[PDB]
Amino acid sequence: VVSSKPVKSYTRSRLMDIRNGMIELEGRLRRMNIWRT
Amino acid sequence: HLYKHPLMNVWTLWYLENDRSKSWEDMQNEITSFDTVEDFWSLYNHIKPPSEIKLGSDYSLFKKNIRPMWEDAANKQGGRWVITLNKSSKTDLDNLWLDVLLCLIGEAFDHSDQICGAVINIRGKSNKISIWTADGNNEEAALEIGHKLRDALRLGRNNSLQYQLHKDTMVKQNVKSIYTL
């Protein structure tokens, strides 16, 4: 059914493919000891 | 690197420092929100996998303007598909969690507007991964989502899926399951 939010799907495989072809947030990631490189 | 693949929904990542807190304590932290595949991957590559975070911590990915709580309007009448992971390895854990995230952001479910978010509880001994849905009485949606989950994670009998209403989950110390897969 047509609505303002059309479907945008991505398979797991597609998403992984996109991953392969590749702010002040670092501070808060580090503060929570969540940061990783 | 200007262009990015847009997502259908905006998502927010949450970190819970501690699962037990006093009634005035807010141990739940917003980390960031994302609108694209590339932004999600960027976020993912810079945070610790659930196999490396502190015991008693939670990771939670929820749609924008939905909190990782059941008291929220989006979750109040809803429920969750629960997966219990006893004696699961670390790589398997990380992979399951990531595949769940990919199900969410990739819109792998037909009843997408029934998906609220997902959360992983790390407790060392037995960890858990749950997918939260908006309405426990929506049998068709719940069942569809459960089946998709079952396939997407390649689960066997060993790990059963349990659909639990949030209202029925209020026990200090088992919980009734509406559906089982």
Swiss-Prot record, chain A:
Component of the osk RNP complex, which is composed of at least exu, yps, aret/bruno, cup, and the mRNA of osk. Interacts with the decapping activators me31B and tral. Component of the nanos RNP complex, which is composed of at least smg, cup, tral, me31B, the CCR4-NOT complex members Rga/NOT2 and Caf1, and the mRNA of nanos (nos). Interacts with btz. Recruited to the 3'-UTR of nos and osk mRNAs by smg and btz, respectively. The chain holds residues 318 to 376 of 1117 of the full protein. A motif (YXXXXLphi motif 1) lies at residues 10-16. Predominantly expressed in ovaries and in 0-2 hours old embryos. Weakly expressed in testis. Expressed in young embryos through stage 9, then it decreases throughout the rest of embryogenesis. In ovaries, it is expressed in germ cells throughout pre-vitellogenic development, but is not expressed in the somatic follicle cells. In germarial cysts, the protein (and not the transcripts) is transported selectively into the oocyte. Belongs to the 4E-T/EIF4E-T family. It comes from Drosophila melanogaster. The YXXXXLphi motifs mediate interaction with eIF4E1. It comes from the Eukaryota. This is Protein cup. Disruption phenotype: Mislocalization and precocious expression of orb in the ovary, accumulation of high levels of orb in nurse cells, elongation of orb poly-A tails, hyperphosphorylation of orb and reduced osk mRNA levels. Reduced number of germ cells. The gene is cup. Adapter protein that plays a central role in localization of transcripts in the oocyte and in young embryos. Maintains RNA targets in a repressed state by promoting their deadenylation and protects deadenylated mRNAs from further degradation. Binds to and recruits eIF-4E to the 3'-UTR of some mRNA targets which prevents interaction between eIF4E1 and eIF4G. This may contribute to translational repression but does not appear to be necessary for it to occur. Can promote translational repression independently of deadenylation and eIF4E1 binding. A motif (YXXXXLphi motif 2) lies at residues 24-30. It is found in: Cytoplasm; Nucleus; Cytoplasm, Cytoplasmic ribonucleoprotein granule.
UniProtKB/Swiss-Prot annotation, chain B:
Phosphorylation increases the ability of the protein to bind to mRNA caps and to form the eIF4F complex. It is found in: Cytoplasm, Cytoplasmic ribonucleoprotein granule; Cytoplasm; Nucleus, Nuclear body. GO terms for biological process: regulation of translation; RNA metabolic process; translation; translational initiation. GO terms for cellular component: cytoplasm; cytosol; eukaryotic translation initiation factor 4F complex; muscle cell postsynaptic specialization; neuromuscular junction; neuronal ribonucleoprotein granule; nuclear body; P-body. One of its GO terms (molecular function) is RNA cap binding. It comes from the Eukaryota. Keywords: Cytoplasm, Initiation factor, Nucleus, Phosphoprotein, Protein biosynthesis, RNA-binding, Translation regulation. MRNA binds at W24, E25, W70, E71, R123, G124, K125, S126, N127, K128. Expressed at the posterior end of developing oocytes (at protein level). Preferential expression in the pole cells, at different developmental stages. Belongs to the eukaryotic initiation factor 4E family. Recognizes and binds the 7-methylguanosine (m7G)-containing mRNA cap during an early step in the initiation of protein synthesis and facilitates ribosome binding by inducing the unwinding of the mRNAs secondary structures. In 0-1 hour embryos, forms a complex with me31B, cup, tral and pAbp which binds to various mRNAs including maternal mRNAs, and down-regulates their expression during the maternal-to-zygotic transition. eIF4F is a multi-subunit complex, the composition of which varies with external and internal environmental conditions. It is composed of at least eIF4A, eIF4E1 and eIF4G1. Recruited by cup in oocytes and in early embryos, preventing the interaction with eIF4G. The interaction with cup therefore prevents the translation of key transcripts such as oskar (osk) and nanos (nos) in some regions in the early embryo. Interacts with mxt. Interacts with 4E-T and Thor. This is Eukaryotic translation initiation factor 4E1. It comes from Drosophila melanogaster. The chain holds residues 77 to 259 of 259 of the full protein.
